[PDB]
Structure 1
Amino acid sequence: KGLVPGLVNLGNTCFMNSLLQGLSACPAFIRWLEEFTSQYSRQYLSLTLLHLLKALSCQEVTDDEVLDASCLLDVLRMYRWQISSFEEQDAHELFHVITSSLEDERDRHWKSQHPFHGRLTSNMVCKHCEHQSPVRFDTFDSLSLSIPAWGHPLTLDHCLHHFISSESVRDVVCDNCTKRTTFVKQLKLGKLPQCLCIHLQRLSWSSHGTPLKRHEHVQFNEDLDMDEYKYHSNASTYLFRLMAVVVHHGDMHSGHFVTYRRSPPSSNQWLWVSDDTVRKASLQEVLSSSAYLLFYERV
């Protein structure tokens, strides 16, 4: 049986257990952690994180194994994220706590940055004079995509193109037109990460003034080509493969996180992980889920 260990839920901690199942399903991330923590053999977040992921990245060693990951929460609670140990939390916020802690830990240098780290471009041209303000590069650790509005079938490609589409920005100070005036702004992708985390924003703001859970199903594929969203015309192909899906069930206040991930080879077999419970799941169930976080790895 190709089942991973489960994780106990010690008080609305599914948001952590779902992220850990997803992260351990990303082999490039674990290889980087092993390389990064190898220097300590010449406390720290990386060592605590790798101990859990190494165990979750392999088939269980004992029947119906269940682990506890709250050692990880303890160290984050001590140094990086002041949160309770019983309140519901956002798995995407935790992903950024972990990713920020590792960049801080790396800063303190022949080793590479972690594989989630990418860079986006921002181009802007004034519509008045038609002069192109200098490009701006910002790093990213995940793509947070707004879900568009009868939208027929809704696809991840649509959400990506909307994130990359140009927009009209009024009232910005043109240096040539010296001024304000109206600009065209557009975000593209400069450097793609080896590990790509896609965040589908399932919370919007209502016309009334209250959050709205977005239940709509966004179609996503096991294979993802990212060429259409690159800034630069380089010749390198950019093909990504689905490693794991974090799914959120419920409304805005209440909810539950679940994770679909691949089985570890000691491949094309999938698992449904809900905290302490691990089931074999078919690819059909995976592709029909309501994705929240998507973990892709470059092939």
Structure 2
Amino acid sequence: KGLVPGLVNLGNTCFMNSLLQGLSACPAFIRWLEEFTSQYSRQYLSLTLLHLLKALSCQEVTDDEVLDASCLLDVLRMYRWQISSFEEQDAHELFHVITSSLEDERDGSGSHWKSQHPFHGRLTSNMVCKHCEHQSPVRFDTFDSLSLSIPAATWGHPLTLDHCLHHFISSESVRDVVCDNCTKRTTFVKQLKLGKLPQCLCIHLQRLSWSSHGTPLKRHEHVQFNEDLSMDEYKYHSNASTYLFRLMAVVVHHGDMHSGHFVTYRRSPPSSNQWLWVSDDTVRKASLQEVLSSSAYLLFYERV
């Protein structure tokens, strides 16, 4: 049986366990960590992170294996992220703590010939004044995940990841911005595109909105996603290089805003096309049909 180890939940820590199952299911990320931590054989977050992911990226070595990942939380609690060890947290916030710690760790490392971690991408922002049609220059900012707003849902109208992506990329009217031509303010047209695509693509579907009344709203709507994802339509340049991605893992959030539980669907490791449902310490075989029917929250794609 090709089952991975489970992770014990020592106090509402499923937000960490679900992220780790997803990250260990991204082989390019683990290969980068091995390359990055190889310089230390010439403490640190990357060494603690790789120890867990290397174990979770392979089939269990004993029947019903269960590991404990709170050594990772201890070091983050000490140096990067001040939280309790028992309160519920957001797996996407943790993803950005980990990703920020690794970029900070690399900035202080001595082998600068090595590449940035594979989740790191760059987005473009183009802007033009509607009054004088003077295009401002291009602005590139980095990103470690795409946080997509979930549009309004209609009965009988499918809600697809492609729709969420196009809405993130669509142009918009931005009122009351100063112009350098009209000296002024005025209304601008703004659009975000994708300049550099990451080898590992993390998609964050925002399941929290703000209500008209003034309180958060959990977004229960099912967002259709595919095992294969083509990102060509969202590139800034007319790059003739194709950008095809494959689904590696899904992090799913069950429950409301205050309370909730994180779960992860991931591929089985080859020692392939078999899927697993991982809920903390419990690992079960799952079909791809169950995976595609889940309410995705974090989607991990890897470029092929």
| Shared fold per TM-score greater than 0.5 | yes
Measured in 2, the distance between the counterparts of 1:288 and 1:3 equals 21
Distance 1:114 1:151, change over 3 A: farther
* Deviation, structure 1 residue 150: 4.5
> Using a 3 Å threshold, how does the CA distance of structure 1 residues 151 and 95 change in structure 2: closer, same or farther?
farther
- Render the CA deviation track for 1:221-244: whole Å, top value 9, x for unaligned: 000000000000111000000000
Give the distance between the partners of 1:49 and 1:182, measured in 2 at CA: 46
- C-alpha deviation, 1:256, in angstroms: 0.2
Measure, in 2, the Cα distance between the counterparts of 1:151 and 1:87: 38
Per-residue CA shift, 1:191-231, capped at 9, x if unaligned? 00000000000000000000000000000000000000000
The answer to whether structure 1 residue 247 and structure 2 residue 252 are counterparts is yes
Provide structure 1 residue ranges, at least 5 long, that are not aligned to the other structure: none
Mapped to 1, the partners of 2:89 and 2:123 lie a distance apart of 27
CA distance in 2 between counterparts of 1:242 and 1:234 reads: 23
**Distance (Å, rounded) in 1 between the aligned partners of 2:124 and 2:155:** 31
2:188 corresponding residue in structure 1? 183
Q: Structure 2 CA distance, aligned partners of 1:146 and 1:110?
A: 36
Q: Tell me how far apart the structure 2 counterparts of residues 272 and 231 of structure 1 sit (CA, whole Å).
A: 36
Aligned runs of 1:150-299 on 2, under 5 Å? 150=155, 152-299=157-304
| Runs of 4 or more consecutive aligned structure 1 residues displaced over 3 Å after TM superposition | none
1:102-146: CA deviations, max 9, x gaps?
A: 000000x00000000000000000010101001100000000000
Give 1:254 deviation, angstroms.
0.1
| Counterpart Cα distance in 1 of 2:142 and 2:155 | 34
Helix, strand or coil: the match of 1:106? helix
For 1:170 and 1:119, the matched residues in 2 are separated by 25
Q: Report the counterpart of residue 77 of structure 1 in structure 2.
A: 77
1:245-265 CA distance string (max 9 Å, x none): 000000000000000000000
Report Cα offsets for 1:40-84 as digits up to 9, x if no partner: 000000000000000000000000000000000000000000000
CA–CA distance in 2 between the matches of 1:182 and 1:238?
A: 34
Q: Equivalents in 2 of 1:247, 1:89: separation in Å?
A: 14
Q: Once the two structures are superposed, what CA deviation does each residue of 1:141-166 show, in whole Å capped at 9, x if it has no partner?
A: 00000000757000000000000000
Alignment of 1:92-103 (within 5 A): 92-103=92-103
C-alpha displacement of 1:4 = 0.2
* 2:299 partner SS: strand
Looking at structure 2, the residues matched to 135 and 15 of structure 1 have their Cα atoms a distance apart, in angstroms, of 37
3-state SS of the aligned residue for 1:138? strand
Determine helix, strand or coil for the equivalent of 2:12: coil
For 1:290 and 1:182, locate their aligned partners in 2 and report how far apart those are by CA, in whole Å: 37
Instruction: Report the Cα distance in structure 1 between the residues aligned to 2:266 and 2:274, rounded to whole angstroms.
Output: 9
Unmatched 5+ stretches in structure 2: none
Q: Cα 1:256–1:147, aligned 2, differ >3 Å: closer, same or farther?
A: same
Partner SS, residue 169 of structure 1: strand
Q: Report sequence identity in percent.
A: 99
How do 1:114-153 and structure 2 match up within 5 A? 114-148=117-151, 150=155, 152-153=157-158
SS at match of 1:209: coil
How far off is 1:7 after superposition?
A: 0.2
Structure 1: how far apart are the matches of 2:276 and 2:64?
A: 14
Q: Residues of 2 paired with 1:173 and 1:147: CA distance?
A: 30
Task: Output the CA distance in 1 between the equivalents of 2:294 and 2:264.
Answer: 10
Structure 1 match to 2:55 = 55
The aligned counterpart of 1:27 is 27
Give the TM-score taking structure 2 as reference length: 0.97
The answer to which of 151-160 and 22-31 deviates more is 151-160
1-structure distance, mates of 2:295, 2:131: 43
Q: How many residues align?
A: 298
| Aligned equivalents of 1:45, 1:82: Cα separation in 2 | 15
Shift of 1:292: 0.1
Inter-partner Cα distance in structure 2 for 1:52 and 1:151:
43
In structure 2, do the counterparts of structure 1 residues 170 and 150 end up closer, same or farther at CA, with 3 Å as the change threshold?
A: farther
C-alpha distance in structure 2 between counterparts of 1:151 and 1:282, whole Å: 25
